[PDB]
Amino acid sequence: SELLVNTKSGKVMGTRVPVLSSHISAFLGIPFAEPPVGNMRFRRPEPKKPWSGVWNASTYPNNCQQYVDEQFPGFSGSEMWNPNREMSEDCLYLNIWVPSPRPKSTTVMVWIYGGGFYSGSSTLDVYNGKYLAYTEEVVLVSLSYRVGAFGFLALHGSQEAPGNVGLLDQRMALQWVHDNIQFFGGDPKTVTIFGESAGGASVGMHILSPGSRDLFRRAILQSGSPNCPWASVSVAEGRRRAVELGRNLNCNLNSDEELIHCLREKKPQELIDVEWNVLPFDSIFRFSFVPVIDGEFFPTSLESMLNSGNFKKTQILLGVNKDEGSFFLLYGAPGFSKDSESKISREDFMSGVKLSVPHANDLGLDAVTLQYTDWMDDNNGIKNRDGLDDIVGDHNVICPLMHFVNKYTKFGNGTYLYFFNHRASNLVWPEWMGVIHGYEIEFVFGLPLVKELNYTAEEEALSRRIMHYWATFAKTGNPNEPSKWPLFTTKEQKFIDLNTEPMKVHQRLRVQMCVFWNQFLPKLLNAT
Amino acid sequence: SELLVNTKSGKVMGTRVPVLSSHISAFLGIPFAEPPVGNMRFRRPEPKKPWSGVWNASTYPNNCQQYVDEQFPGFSGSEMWNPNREMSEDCLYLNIWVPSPRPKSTTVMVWIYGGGFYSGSSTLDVYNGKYLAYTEEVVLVSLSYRVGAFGFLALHGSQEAPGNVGLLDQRMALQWVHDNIQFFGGDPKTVTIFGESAGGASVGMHILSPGSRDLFRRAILQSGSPNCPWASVSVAEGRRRAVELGRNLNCNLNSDEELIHCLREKKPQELIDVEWNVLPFDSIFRFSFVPVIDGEFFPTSLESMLNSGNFKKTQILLGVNKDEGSFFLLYGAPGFSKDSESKISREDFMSGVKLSVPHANDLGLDAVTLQYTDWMDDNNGIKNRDGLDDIVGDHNVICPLMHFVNKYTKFGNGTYLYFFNHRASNLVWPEWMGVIHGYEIEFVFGLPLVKELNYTAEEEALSRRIMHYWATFAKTGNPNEPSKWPLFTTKEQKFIDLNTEPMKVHQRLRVQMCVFWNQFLPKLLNAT
Ligand SMILES: O=c1ccc2c([nH]1)CCC[C@@H]2NCCCCCCCCCCNc1c2c(nc3ccccc13)CCCC2
Ligand SMILES: O=c1ccc2c([nH]1)CCC[C@@H]2NCCCCCCCCCCNc1c2c(nc3ccccc13)CCCC2
Ligand SMILES: *[C@@H]1O[C@H](CO)[C@@H](O)[C@H](O)[C@H]1NC(C)=O
Ligand SMILES: *[C@@H]1O[C@H](CO)[C@@H](O)[C@H](O)[C@H]1NC(C)=O
Ligand SMILES: *[C@@H]1O[C@H](CO)[C@@H](O)[C@H](O)[C@H]1NC(C)=O
Ligand SMILES: *[C@@H]1O[C@H](CO)[C@@H](O)[C@H](O)[C@H]1NC(C)=O
Ligand SMILES: *[C@@H]1O[C@H](CO)[C@@H](O)[C@H](O)[C@H]1NC(C)=O
């Protein structure tokens, strides 16, 4: 039995699944920690106690408790990101697809979902690992981690809610993979972590954090990086937001112990109903409970670690999509709709910029406005919409990433940078939204290989080229087999487009805007 | 006798001069003030006292004492701007060209020379009025005014050295036209003042200043406006620079009366030798002794007079040249030369920005750099050369002028704006300098009409259309006889190119950059 595997914590029984005219083994819902319920809510995870008997790993697990998006109910485009199982605090499980026949000690890839640290699930259709596992002969793992207040409530100095527990969830699944993946045909010495949005930030946080470094080999970051402005907060802002969650729910605030005790008595969705209330500003692309810069998981500030080379030195493959900003504008900024072209007045432009840079003084806002307005044609709806689209994507994803890539490449052992700009032929979102945050994932996970999902043949070919770059990179530290994706170097700053056309190599991704965002604006905000 | 005219201060005898194979009358070297010599150095001008007999006005006067440029000795391109007569403090004279036969009561144009308030002459070949006078049938006057410390040494509170006496020279020459021009066939109700660079700034200071307003009808400003960053200083900075002039010359600094007395015993060129020493910073396009905002010639700050409409309401015609900055970079910035393409390293670009905006803090300098650098291609010597060129132009001439024209047009009675971008066929400066500060003047004064100067036919036609637009505007407030130069309006902000090609109307001259210079950079420098 291929399907019956003994792990360090007990036996597990998977299920044989179909993929593209063949089959593979899937092991769904394997527990890697004790359920973090009751008194364990907000605590570091504990390893799962060994169980007797056979764990039924034939079906997907619960998803962690999270804010459910109801903006477009029944709309496929938004529903595909929402949980597709029952939500429960009992949600620390992982999932594994193993090629049939079982390999000997093959390359392992562990997927870390995004969703702004406030949402996500391991079980979504677009994260189905069976296509990538099959086509590339890797052992594919998806983990899960607490999100929202559950994962990231931070009262620094309490051991009861220390912060960063969702990251430590991640770290325990990786520890689990290190310990057990050899029984499924993986090499624990050849594991790649990869993920998107807060998942890509997560990946980079494990590159940084000393307790996480030795649990993987190399890394892929899609549309996220550790240093994103939404991806972390100071101990003092986490403490303020935690206390404010308390005040929103009429908690006793006299000490950490009484606050924590009161928050532990509330049902999950009571916390989620006030979660957004703790944000200190009106905004877009900001999340309430995120990683905290604590001196433990992160021993010093991210920038100082990045300048000093205090981070895992290995190979990384990362990149961005063309219009990262668009869905955040749709969901939170005035003048945008999924049923129109979303031409934006000048008034709505200016309000969108305040939302996008909520921490900027007036001089700050003026700077952004200035950098992104065509003053010959400032009442042009299309230019205002697209200029605000670039603000949001440059500020939140692209420029944070180009900073990370430049800092990392100084010490690293090799960097491959992409720019994903294919708009899929079957997209249900409107044209104006372009190449959307998250929409490279379907290609990574091989979904265009499924004829019933109505992708073009050229899209199947692109997904295959992407899968092979990613799996090759995972296996060898180099996405190219022995036409060529070059190494990004400090000197030449090369990157490739990723679309259906023949591969073009460019240099200096978004340098002009990235200088503004990485060098001038911070300098101005620090001076004023 | 057409040549013998009796004026309010005595009789004058002019001379018949050949022009384009006809003739006209010239009255050269007419005194309009007492010689501002000895104990009148630094004081307000006084009116010329009447003379007996007949003043011989057959030859040009002396030029005012000034720093003579010796950077390119005998090179025609720089010597055309230097004094071509003896320098003397006894320099307050004016020149008049009258059509023959004498007209009855025709349009007058009075020219005010530039040269940064530290130089210039009424007598240059390029300012010879006979072509414009003859072709357009106008009475053409050129005045003179003290420059440098002789005209702008300001010790506010003293009546011996109040500041702005060069402006009052100009104004006395205007009062003399108002009183005497009817005798030469001009109408004093129909006078236009025009000037270039500091001349143009001059013209606009007369529009602003209550004491000058009633001595002209309308105005033409060429590459200068009153609010230029070099065109004025506070009474504090004026005082500081006058004291420093004293210190550079070992003067008793114990009182105004003692400092002034010492500066009056110095020979003129000893002031001139240390003139540049008093500037606060290393700079380009900055000049030591300039108009002061005194509370008398200018009752309040230029900006509040402009905002409140406290100025003469009339018709204006004004404009700028394509490459105003270029000769300033040649004379004073690193990597520039008249004999090469002046491809500028990034280091010489940076050191050029600091000279170009000598007041800026580091944040300021950063902003400028960022606005004018292509970060894809930052070591491109040509893009750096041209970027710095535009900096110098935009900051010192174009954006000050575009501020002025927008504030003026809210109250004025008609504005016409031009962008002169014709590089002359027979230019002696290199191509990199483009369309140079001062090089429209030859068109305006009709020099291309002289075959021996070896302009093309099309440059001849251009000079004729230009003279005709200026003289038609002088005559009627509208450059067009009713292809049409449209009015500049607050809404549509139209202007035309002036070159050898058919008219193009465009909108919003240099708005993208003028937004940075007039709105953002000043907020940035105000916070920090
Ligand atoms: O960004 C916002 C928007 C609105 C608001 C705020 N912030 C805070 C202040 C209050 C305001 N409204 C409060 C409720 C917030 C609504 C929550 C946003 C829902 C986002 C849905 C996440 N889904 C994903 C989508 C896409 N890509 C994703 C990729 C990463 C995983 C999640 C994704 C592409 C298109 C549509 C959806
Ligand atoms: O602008 C500068 C340049 C250099 C320097 C400073 N400032 C201050 C710091 C010290 C430095 N060097 C000190 C010597 C100063 C020399 C002054 C420059 C001479 C310019 C001569 C005026 N000539 C004119 C020219 C032109 N146009 C003019 C139109 C306006 C009237 C004068 C003009 C076009 C081309 C060449 C010349
Ligand atoms: C395992 O669990 C699921 C769902 O709760 C069930 O439907 C399935 O048939 C079970 N199978 C075995 C072999 O235990
Ligand atoms: C990775 O490190 C090894 C030696 O430690 C070296 O040979 C190789 O060149 C490095 N590669 C890159 C791209 O840094
Ligand atoms: C794609 O195409 C087919 C046939 O043209 C259709 O029946 C099916 O509904 C479409 N697939 C999806 C899931 O959109
Ligand atoms: C006036 O001066 C000029 C030139 O120096 C000359 O040709 C003419 O003789 C003079 N006229 C009289 C009356 O002196
Ligand atoms: C100039 O003023 C007159 C009346 O004083 C007016 O009717 C005319 O339109 C004005 N023109 C402009 C361009 O303001």
CB neighbourhood size of A185 (10 A):
22
DSSP assignment string, B83-104: -SS-B-S---EEEEEE-SSPPS
**Range list of β-strands (E), A379-422:** 414-420
Going by alpha carbons, the residue nearest to atom 10 of ligand 6 is B56
CB neighbourhood size of B229 (10 A):
17
Amino acid at B404: F
Pairing of strands A414-420, A15-19: unpaired
CB B421 within 8 A of CB B503: no
CA B172 to chain centre: 17
Peptide bond into A45 cis (omega under 30): no
**After what residues is chain A interrupted, C–N > 2.5 A?**
482
- Distance of alpha carbon A290 from alpha carbon A152, whole angstroms: 5
Contact A527 B366 (CB under 8 A): no
Name the 3-class secondary structure at B330. helix
Domain of residue A116, residue span? 1-528
Going by alpha carbons, the residue nearest to atom 12 of ligand 5 is A453
Q: How far away, in angstroms, is B466 Cα from ligand 2 center? A: 26
Experimental method: X-ray
Pairing of strands B93-98, B106-112: unpaired
Structure tokens at B4: 């013998």
Reference B223, options B134, B112, B350, B358; nearest CA is: B112
Strand-by-strand arrangement of the B54-56 sheet = B4-7, B10-13, B54-56
- Distance of alpha carbon B429 from alpha carbon B442, whole angstroms: 15
Mention every residue, 6+ apart, whose C-beta is less than 8 A from residue B346: B378, B379, B384
- Distance of alpha carbon B394 from alpha carbon B381, whole angstroms: 20
How many folded domains does chain A comprise? 1
What are the φ and ψ backbone dihedral angles of B507, each rounded to 5 degrees?
A: -130, 145
CB B331 within 8 A of CB B322: no
**Residue tagged 């070059």 (tokens):** A486
- Three-point CA angle B494, B497, B502, nearest 5°: 110
- Distance of alpha carbon B11 from alpha carbon B180, whole angstroms: 11
- Three-point CA angle B84, B86, B87, nearest 5°: 105
The DSSP call for residue B516 is I
Contact B370 A515 (CB under 8 A): yes
Pairing of strands B139-142, B93-98: antiparallel
- Distance of alpha carbon A161 from alpha carbon A252, whole angstroms: 16
Q: Is A148 exposed, middle or buried (0-12, 13-18, 19+ CB in 10 A)?
A: buried
Pairing of strands B106-112, B139-142: parallel
Mutating which of B346, B376, B508, B518 best tests the A interface, going by the most A Cβ atoms within 10 A? B376
Query: Which residue in B370, B375, B511 is closest to A375 by CB distance?
Result: B511
Q: Which residues line ligand 6 (CB under 6 A)?
A: B 56, 58-59
Q: Is B90 exposed, middle or buried (0-12, 13-18, 19+ CB in 10 A)?
A: middle
Q: Which ligand is nearest to the CA of A453?
A: 5
Contact A512 B366 (CB under 8 A): no
**Residue tagged 């105005």 (tokens):** B219
DSSP assignment string, A317-356: EEEEETBTTHHHHHHHSTT--TTS-----HHHHHHHHHHH
Structure tokens at B56: 């011989």
CB A147 within 8 A of CB A275: no
Q: How far away, in angstroms, is B140 Cα from ligand 7 center? A: 27
- Distance of alpha carbon A496 from alpha carbon B149, whole angstroms: 62
- Three-point CA angle A499, A504, A508, nearest 5°: 105
Could you tell me the CATH number of the domain that includes residue B321?
3.40.50.1820
Q: Which ligand is nearest to the CA of B489?
A: 7
Reference A322, options A442, A436, A214; nearest CA is: A436
Reference B436, options B455, B419, B421; nearest CA is: B421
Structure tokens at A102: 């079982």
Mention every residue, 6+ apart, whose C-beta is less than 8 A from residue A263: A41, A42, A149, A153, A161, A245, A246, A249, A251, A271
Amino acid at A277: N
Query: Which residue in A370, A519, A520 is closest to B515 by CB distance?
Result: A370
Structure tokens at B159: 């009546």
